[PDB]
Structure formats: C-alpha cells, structure tokens
C-alpha cells in the first residue's frame, strides 16, 4: 500500500481532497495499488509547523506532499518550512497556489514542484504582446529585490534573441516613500512605455509620483503585473493600465484534482521498475535519503496528463509549468473589463473596445525623438 499526505488550509478543502482521492481510486485498475491520503492544518509558529509536519508525514512513509498557501492575506511563508524540512530527503512537494520567484533556484530548493506560472511568464507574455504592436522602445522599472531581478534577467535575455535593446533600466529601491529622481530622469526620453513590476505598496507611491509629474494622459501607455493592480494599489491608479491577470487564479479544487491525477499517473509509471525502497520514518533516527530519490522527480517532470480540468499540464526543465493561459484586462473608469486572451504566441484580442490612457482611440506610437541634438566638438587648428 501507499499513502500521499498533504497540507491544506481548511477542513472543507480536506473533505474535497478526500473525495478527489476516492474518485481517483475509483479510476484505473487499482490492482495492488491503494492510496489513502492524510491531511494536516497550518500553524502560526513556523517552528511548530515544521516539527509537526515532519513528525506526522515522515512517520507515515509518504510518497508525495502537497502544500497550499493558507487563507491569511499577503506574505509567502507557506512552503518554506515544509520545503526545507522535506528537502532533507528527496520526497517531492507539489505547490498549489504559491507563485514566487524565490522557489525557482534549484540550488536553494532542490526538491520542489508546482503547477502555477511564476512571475517570469509575465515578462514572456509582455514580449509576446509587444511583438504584435511593434513599438520596441521598452523602458522598465524594477524593484531591487529577488522578485524584480528575476524579471529583469528574463526580459534581458529574451530581447537578445531578437537583437534589440530596451532603452534604460532604473532601480528605485524597496521600502521607500519618496522617489523623484527616477521619474525626472525618465521624463526626457523617446520611449512612451512605463512597464513596471512593483510589489503592492510601492505601486501607490510610484503612481502618486507619476501623477504629480503630469505624465498620464495623451500618450505614455502603462504596463503592469498581476500584483500591481490588486488591493490598495488599485485605489490610487490612472485609467488605461493593461492590468494583466491570470485565469483560474484563486481556484484550488481543480488544481487539487489535476495534482492528484498527475501524482497517480507518476506513481503508476514508477511502480513498473526495479526494486523500490520506502522513505524513512521517525524524523530522528534516519540521516540518509533513499536511493531512487531524484528518480521520482525526474519521471514526474516527464509526466503529461492533459485531461484533468484544463489543458496540457506539462512540466519544463525548471519545473514551474508550460502552456499557461492568461486574460489581459484593462482598467477603464474602474470595473475592469476583459479585453483579450493569451494562450502562447497566439495573443487574440477581443472586439469590445480599447481606451488608451488619454481618452483617445488610436494606438499611441512610442517615439518623439525630441528634434534636438547636443553636438560636442574638440578644438582643432584647421577644422574647428
């Protein structure tokens, strides 16, 4: 027999997980392979959470672990204690609603999988959308943390394949309430795009600074990320921002079903192999990983199952996801209205309308050229 434990948020989610695992057991042949699941709730103290999760799940000799973000607002502490504790061995952990760039460095987290697009796909879809409007004068603002640095690196390498340069890049530092030099420097240029990847609160101050510089209106389009038009950042914001978001974001039951289906497929694929051991139990008396640890992860990367709730749930080399779906939304006098769909190099605009941040209707071309030069010469005898 085998067991697949998990860490969920509420008891209703636990009941949904039980129903899903029962349905999965009802599927397939279920010959000599039974998977009864166990669940556990969250805790405020991270130390208590880590100790409890190891002593509970490790002692049960699990074969996989599922972790989901707790219902508490903001923050990202959801996977870190479980990932660190279960990272001692090579038991894979599946993410459910944790989209952060810190969990992409395989050197730090050597065993972590999820099915949610990270924040790099925002840069990828920005490039894909820009390729169809033909402006190619991107100037972007990046927060000086690990979150914005990944986006900067992702945007830098993608444009090199097309042999293009993206104006200038600025750095405004996190946890500050006064930025004026960056906006003033960006005022004089030939690039009418304000591509921005902020982090919640900083969006408010940058929007106030931009509004005080009278740059929103009759040109100067804006592009932002999913987290830059949510909550308090939405209150102080100008219209016309292409506030791209993600489809089926705050949905987990479908993701739970997809995860359990792919886990069952991977387990069935792995069962037909050579001798297989079991992960140790006790959290105390064992200091060695089992032999075929990374083998399960490797066979889990190459597991494709495009029949659960959505399209092809394909894991790439990084392990985040492949072939995701977005929904380009545009602010228009509040009450965001869907404007287009994205499915991968096939951006399909809808036919509702477009309102650029000036009240106009034509697409604003991003170039002025200033019709002014600053010639510099060196004194010479017969020339100057």
């Amino acid at each position, epitope marked *: 027999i085998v067991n697949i434990g998990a860490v969920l948020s509420t008891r209703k989610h636990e009941q949904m997980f039980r129903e899903a695992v029962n349905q999965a057991n009802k599927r397939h042949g279920s010959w000599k392979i039974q998977l009864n699941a166990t669940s556990v709730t969250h805790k405020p103290n991270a130390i208590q959470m880590a100790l409890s999760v190891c002593e509970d799940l490790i002692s049960s000799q699990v074969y996989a672990i599922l972790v989901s973000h707790p219902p508490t607002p903001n923050d990202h502490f959801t996977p870190t204690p479980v990932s660190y504790t279960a990272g001692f061995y090579r038991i894979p952990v599946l993410g459910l609603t944790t989209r952060m760039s810190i969990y992409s460095d395989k050197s730090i987290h050597l065993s972590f999988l999820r099915t949610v697009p990270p924040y790099s796909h925002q840069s990828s879809v920005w490039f894909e959308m820009m390729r169809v409007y033909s402006w190619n004068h991107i100037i972007l603002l990046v927060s000086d943390d690990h979150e914005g640095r990944a986006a900067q690196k992702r945007l830098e390498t993608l444009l090199e394949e097309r042999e293009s340069k993206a104006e200038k890049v600025l750095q405004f530092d996190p946890g500050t309430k006064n930025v004026t030099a960056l906006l003033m420097e960006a005022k004089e240029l030939e690039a009418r795009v304000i591509i921005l990847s902020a982090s919640e609160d900083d969006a408010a101050t940058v929007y106030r600074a931009a509004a005080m510089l009278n740059m929103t209106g009759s040109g100067y389009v804006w592009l932002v990320g999913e987290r830059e038009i949510s909550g308090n950042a939405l209150r102080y914001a100008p219209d016309g921002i292409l506030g791209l978001q993600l489809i089926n974001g705050k949905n987990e039951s479908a993701h739970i079903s997809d995860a359990v289906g792919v886990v069952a497929q991977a387990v069935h694929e792995l069962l037909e192999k050579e001798n297989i051991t079991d992960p140790p139990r006790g959290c105390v008396g064992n200091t060695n990983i089992w032999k075929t640890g990374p083998l399960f992860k490797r066979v889990l990367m190459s597991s494709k199952y495009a029949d659960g709730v959505t399209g092809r749930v394909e894991f790439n080399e990084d392990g985040d996801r492949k072939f995701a779906n977005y929904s380009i939304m545009n602010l228009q006098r509040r*009450k965001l209205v869907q404007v287009g769909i994205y499915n991968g190099t096939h951006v399909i605009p809808n036919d509702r309308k477009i309102i650029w941040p000036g009240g106009e209707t034509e697409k604003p071309r991003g170039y002025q050229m200033s019709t002014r030069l600053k010639i510099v010469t060196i004194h010479q005898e017969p020339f100057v």
Partner: antibody
Amino acid sequence: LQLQESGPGLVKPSQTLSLTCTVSGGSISSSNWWSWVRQPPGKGLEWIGEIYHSGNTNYNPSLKSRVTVSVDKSKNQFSLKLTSVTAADTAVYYCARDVSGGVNWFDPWGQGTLVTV
Amino acid sequence: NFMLTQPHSVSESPGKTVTISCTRSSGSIASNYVQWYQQRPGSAPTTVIYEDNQRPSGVPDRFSGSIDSSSNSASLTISGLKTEDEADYYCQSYDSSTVVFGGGTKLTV
C-alpha cells in the same frame, strides 16, 4: 452645463421605456462619461449603466441581458432600451454624467423624469 | 457587490453637532473613495461631500467628512443645524465591479 430628460410618456405595463436627456452647454463627444441613475419611490438609489461615445459600456451584472443604452453624437442625445420591463419597474430616472477627475462622482444632477408603470 | 446600511431617521437640537455613519458590511471601506449626496424633498440631489476632505464651491464649511478605518464606516458631521438643512443624505461608493448607494437618512428639527 444643464440637462433636461424627456421620456415618451408611455407607462403601460409590459413595455419598453426610451427617454432622451438633452444637454445644453455641453458636448456629447468628450473624454467624460454619462450614466443613468434609477430611484424607486420611497426607497434607496441604484445605478443602471454608463455610456461612452467612444465604444464599450458597462450596464450592470444583475440585468446584463435586458438593458441596452445607445448614443447619437449627431443629435447630442443618448437613449436606453429597457426590454421586457416588468410592471413593478415604476421609478424615477435621472441623468447625471460624471466628473473626469480620478474617481466617479455625479455632478451636476439632472432634474429627472417621472414614470409610473 | 455589497450593501450600505444607514439609519432610518435622526433628530437633534438646532445649532448642535450631528454625526451620521454609513457602514459597508463586505470587504473594507478604506481604499476606494466615498461621496455624500444631499437630496431635497421633490428636488434633484445635490453633492455635499466629495473625497471626504474637500467641499464643492459655495458649499457650507459646517459639513465635514471622516473615515473611521477601524469600524469600516464613513462619518459625516454637520454643525450648526438649521431648518433649511432638512433633506435626505445618501452615501455612495464604487467598487471593482459596480457602484452602490446608501439607504439614506432624514433629519428632523
């Protein structure tokens, strides 16, 4: 700017109301917005939709398939077509457009119209 | 979508301070702005408070607005009550989907 709303005068049950709110001193084509306000007798107030001369409009999610509002820049008029209106739809319709600004705030308010289905 | 709760009616002595509260049950009324309209009996409504910190041109300075930010309610204060102020007061707010109006209250001298 001033607003004057005139209705068809027909308040028969199971019909469609279509009024027009003319604007004096203002231009229909602009960067602003125009919206309709409904007030039932002896109750609160609710918003039924907003118009824009440049295209898309957002009426409401409650009656998304029963209300259609159109504009005509030639006559400086905007009118609504509320189909399949029940006999209990007796209320007063007012036309206050918007303020550009950064948030929605109705200023000024039209004199409104009286309808008793 | 949500609803706004307002008391049916209030009464106070003239020349005193009267505080009216509009409460938003769902979410939290702390980010999006609110506005305070006044409608005379049989007349078109007139805006009285916008942005909860500024007043329209020619509006009396007695009216003031404040945000509790703790009980999730907006307060409007009127000083120096007069018989000409007898009208209905409505709280209007906007959300990421639609807009809503308060129940409304009427004061009596």
